[PDB]
Ligand binder design. Sequence first.
Ligand code: 655
Ligand code: CA
Length: 223
Amino acid sequence: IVGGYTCGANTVPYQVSLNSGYHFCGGSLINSQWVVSAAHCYKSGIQVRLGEDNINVVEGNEQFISASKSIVHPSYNSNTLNNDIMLIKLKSAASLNSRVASISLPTSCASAGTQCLISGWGNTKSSGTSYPDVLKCLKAPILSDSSCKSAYPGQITSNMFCAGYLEGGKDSCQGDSGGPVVCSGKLQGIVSWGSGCAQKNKPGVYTKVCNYVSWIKQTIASN
Ligand SMILES: NC(=[NH2+])c1ccc2[nH]c(-c3cccc(OC4CCCC4)c3[O-])nc2c1
Ligand SMILES: [Ca+2]
């Protein structure tokens, strides 16, 4: 997260770290056995780490659970990143409490101007790499579709939306992919991609979760 602030320990209880010997993507807990992340974060050997703040220190509240299976959306396109969403089923259910809680899926899509919270352990520099030990937060608004398509002509599909600041300075970045974009307590986006991090007129692009709620529900119901 570039231009953000330290969230405070366990203040984002639905945030998870996908780990394979190091943190490589974020994700969101939607019920005690499933996590939603981005399809491009897919790899085998994923251990999901819940209740984290410092990902390099066991401070208490952490729950490390292996993924039993990861379901990449069947229409995921790795060249355009269209349908960049993945569901991860946990080997055992997590124990939910005030520090580990799930976030609600939306019933309607959010409008431009809606303020959301984006979080993650990704790079905090736009020019260089500085990875934090604790979770960083950024409050950012959803941009209009016209500003988004004007910034990335021919690359935005209806399953994507832009959020951020056109003046540059605040953005999600490498290591934040797969994590949450929460607006008024509903999960509206998944960190997907961007051009560099926090550059002027290049806002971050997110997977539009409201377009996938029936897919998520039907997939969870059959697995
Ligand atoms: N500027 C942004 N809003 C942005 C947000 C998330 C990003 N994630 C990445 C990213 C870059 C290189 C490799 C990645 O993931 C690979 C390692 C884990 C598997 C895929 C990224 O997510 N760039 C990103 C840029
Ligand atoms: Ca820790």
